[PDB]
């Protein structure tokens, strides 16, 4: 299956191409235009149909976002979006097809089609809510420790010091993405 986007947004497609490949594990191909004055370009996505559907929605949303806005949360939750070299952000982008850009600590720019923005907002809200489910280092799930073994990671500490409820949701997100 193929689909079209604005020719004026080809620049965007190419900037994001590697991230799209990494996140959805797909190939992005742009077809040559049949005429120069064409307002659209056709894309073809290479990979499993699941991966491709999600990439499609990401790319549509990237090229002309139906929603673009900052979500706001406790600054101490910001490590989740920067830690493990962006692994969690990637898993969240996978699960929602939203384009996600960390801003100030406690601020995340979410962007894409509307159903993608709301589902990402929702998931980010849930994480934030679960920070309040602290009932106090202070405890770590084995499987969570397991993902964060990459020693250089500068947000490794902050992540480990997250309460177990946030850790469990992050596991659930990673599990969803694999």
Curated annotation (Swiss-Prot):
Family (UniProt)? Belongs to the N4BP1 family.
Which protein is depicted? Protein KHNYN
Q: Which organism is it from?
A: Homo sapiens (Human)
The opening ranks of the lineage are:
Eukaryota, Metazoa, Chordata, Craniata, Vertebrata
